[PDB]
Amino acid sequence: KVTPALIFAITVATIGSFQFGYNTGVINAPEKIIKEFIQKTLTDKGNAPPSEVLLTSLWSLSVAIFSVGGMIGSFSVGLFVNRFGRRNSMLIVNLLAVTGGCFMGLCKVAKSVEMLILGRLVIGLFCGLCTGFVPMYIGEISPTALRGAFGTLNQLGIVVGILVAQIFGLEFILGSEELWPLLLGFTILPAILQSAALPFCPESPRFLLINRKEEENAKQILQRLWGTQDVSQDIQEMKDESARMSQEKQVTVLELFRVSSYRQPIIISIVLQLSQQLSGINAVFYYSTGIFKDAPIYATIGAGVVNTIFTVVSLFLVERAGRRTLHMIGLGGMAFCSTLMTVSLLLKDMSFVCIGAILVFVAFFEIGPGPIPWFIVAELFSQGPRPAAMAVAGCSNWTSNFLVGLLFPSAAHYLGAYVFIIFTGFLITFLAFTFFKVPETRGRTFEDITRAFEGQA
């Protein structure tokens, strides 16, 4: 059963997903207004005026530093989750959200570009830690038969976060010359609501029984969250996981690549992050505004509604169809839209067909490669290696996002419309990889998933 206790716990957790989505998508709309600020602050200092190269570098640094923070943050989740707990770690890192949000919110008043760059770094550190905390907590408090459905709420949170950031970035909302510090500082508000709500959420009963050896405390939480007495099966299941973890050495990031039974789920974990970040989703949105102009922010907001609708579609299908099926349909459908893009963009100079290709690509992305890579890593591992594995998988997601972001304008300049062909090459490669290497985890236990990798190795 799904009690209001479970819905509340997962909703409060997904505020971190929204934070990641908001901070990712917020920085694009105030570009011209923030560049003007950087230029005014630096010129008013009294020295020689800044060069266009320096001004573009500081803008690029303001954007990119968030990815650097996220890389460090996502890779650092293991320094928190076992030490403090999953619930308590989420609470502790709101101190980074508040410091990050204050730096960005006060950089204009302080007439400081240093505060803006530090603010984006610290919010990067926070979002990075979130991207690993949220799926870990959701993956451990969710009933095994709905682990994927609740897992998809991480991506729903992210997608809604981007959308709100894009809406708020409008001139008549917070995208103004006077209100842009509030636009960046907005991240403080979900952080204060999450902080006030988190002490009312339970700690992971998997964590309490396996890591903290609190069997009764875990049983009471499980009884409340699932609103039953039949928690005896799940408790014994956690006792068999606790047994395994005490028999195995403490799992370090290096051990995941050395131990054969961890090598297969970690290659799966990393490659599924690459399948999301190298799908062509960055390219589809890059060319989006240009295509809408030929036939634009209100249309970009329109792409956000499609993005939201199809994440909800995935949520209602992932427990029926399974992860393997939805990930494959997603990659396949995107490959069909990827080739249709190349033909549309070369024959455009049919913008109506290219708008359709973008809309259907987003629809396919959100069916599988969008939500699945975020929650799948928690399913492929048991308690012992889960934090280390989510540190590696999370860092892989942030690093591949960062490297695609740096190399893509250069690739789009030299290849043009033909840039969607190398994405069709990637999509088919990940479509093949999912078919032969990714096992179905739908409705299965962490112990059943682990026993299967231990049998294969």
Ligand X SMILES: CCCCCCC(CCCCCC)(CO[C@H]1O[C@@H](CO)[C@H](O)[C@@H](O)[C@@H]1O)CO[C@H]1O[C@@H](CO)[C@H](O)[C@@H](O)[C@@H]1O
Q: Where along the sequence are the contacts to ligand Y01 (CB under 6 A)? A: 253, 270, 274, 392, 395-396, 399-400, 403-404, 407
In sequence order, what are the residues at sequence separation of 6 or more whose Cβ sits closer than 8 angstroms to the Cβ of residue 117? 58, 61, 62, 65
Residue 230: both structure tokens together: 């039949």
110, 146, 259, 417: which one contacts ligand X (CB under 6 A)? Answer: 110
Q: Which is nearer to ligand X, 188 or 431 (CB)?
A: 188
Which of 397, 406, 42, 19 is CA-nearest to residue 188?
A: 19
Q: Candidates 2-10, 179-187, 254-262, 397-405: pick the segment binding ligand X (CB under 6 A).
A: 2-10
In sequence order, what are the residues at sequence separation of 6 or more whose Cβ sits closer than 8 angstroms to the Cβ of residue 379? 139, 147, 148, 151, 441, 444, 446, 449
> Angle CA(404)–CA(409)–CA(414) in degrees, nearest 5?
115
- Cβ pair 18, 162 in contact under 8 A: no
Shortest separation between residue 76's beta carbon and ligand X, angstroms: 4
33, 63, 91, 102: which one contacts ligand X (CB under 6 A)? Answer: 102
The item of ligand X, ligand Y01, none sharing an interface with residue 10, based on CB under 5 to 8 Å by kind, is none
The item of ligand X, ligand Y01, none sharing an interface with residue 403, based on CB under 5 to 8 Å by kind, is ligand Y01
Q: Using CB atoms within 10 A of its CB, is residue 35 exposed (0-12), middle (13-18) or buried (19+)?
A: middle
- Cα(359)–Cα(306) distance, integer angstroms: 7
Q: Which residue is nearest to ligand Y01, using beta carbons?
A: 399
Q: DSSP letters of 333-355?
A: HHHHHHHHHHHHHHHH--HHHHH
Q: Which is nearer to ligand X, 8 or 336 (CB)?
A: 8
8, 285, 402, 408: which one contacts ligand X (CB under 6 A)? Answer: 8
Q: Which is nearer to ligand X, 110 or 428 (CB)?
A: 110
Please note each residue after which the chain is broken, C-to-N distance over 2.5 A, or write none. Answer: 295, 349
> Angle CA(22)–CA(25)–CA(31) in degrees, nearest 5?
125
Position 357 contacts ligand X (CB under 6 A):
no
Residue 277 assigned ligand-binding role? yes
- Cα(106)–Cα(111) distance, integer angstroms: 8
Shortest separation between residue 213's beta carbon and ligand Y01, angstroms: 28
What is residue 151's three-state secondary structure?
helix
- Classify residue 3 by its DSSP letter: -
Shortest separation between residue 106's beta carbon and ligand X, angstroms: 5
Residue 276 assigned ligand-binding role? yes
CA-based end-to-end distance of the chain: 36
Residue 113 identity: V
- Classify residue 142 by its DSSP letter: S
Residue 119: both structure tokens together: 């603010």
Position 106 contacts ligand X (CB under 6 A):
yes
Residue 307 assigned ligand-binding role? yes
Q: Which is nearer to ligand Y01, 197 or 253 (CB)?
A: 253
Shortest separation between residue 122's beta carbon and ligand X, angstroms: 6
- Cβ pair 246, 228 in contact under 8 A: no
Q: Candidates 108-116, 167-175, 305-313, 368-376: pick the segment binding ligand X (CB under 6 A).
A: 108-116
The item of ligand X, ligand Y01, none sharing an interface with residue 407, based on CB under 5 to 8 Å by kind, is ligand Y01
Residues between 10 and 69 with contacts to ligand X, criterion CB under 6 A: 42, 45, 47, 50, 58, 69
Shortest separation between residue 272's beta carbon and ligand Y01, angstroms: 11
Shortest separation between residue 69's beta carbon and ligand X, angstroms: 6
Contacts with ligand X by CB under 6 A: the residue count is 36
76, 144, 176, 445: which one contacts ligand X (CB under 6 A)? Answer: 76
- Cα(383)–Cα(377) distance, integer angstroms: 12
Residue 264 assigned ligand-binding role? no
Q: Which is nearer to ligand Y01, 38 or 395 (CB)?
A: 395
Q: DSSP letters of 169-235?
A: TSTTTT-STTTHHHHHHTTHHHHHHHHHHGGGSPPPHHIIIIIT--HHHHHHHHHHHHTSSTTHHHH
Q: Which is nearer to ligand Y01, 37 or 453 (CB)?
A: 453
Residues between 189 and 248 with contacts to ligand X, criterion CB under 6 A: 196-197, 199-200, 203
- Cα(77)–Cα(12) distance, integer angstroms: 19
- Cα(384)–Cα(247) distance, integer angstroms: 10
Residue 423: both structure tokens together: 């994405």
Shortest separation between residue 268's beta carbon and ligand Y01, angstroms: 12
Shortest separation between residue 321's beta carbon and ligand Y01, angstroms: 27
Q: Which is nearer to ligand X, 105 or 370 (CB)?
A: 105
> Per the annotation, where are the binding residues for D-glucose?
155, 276-277, 282, 307, 366, 374
Residues that bind ligand X (CB under 6 A): 4-5, 8, 42, 45, 47, 50, 58, 69, 72-73, 75-76, 79, 92-93, 95-96, 102, 106, 109-115, 117, 121-122, 125, 196-197, 199-200, 203
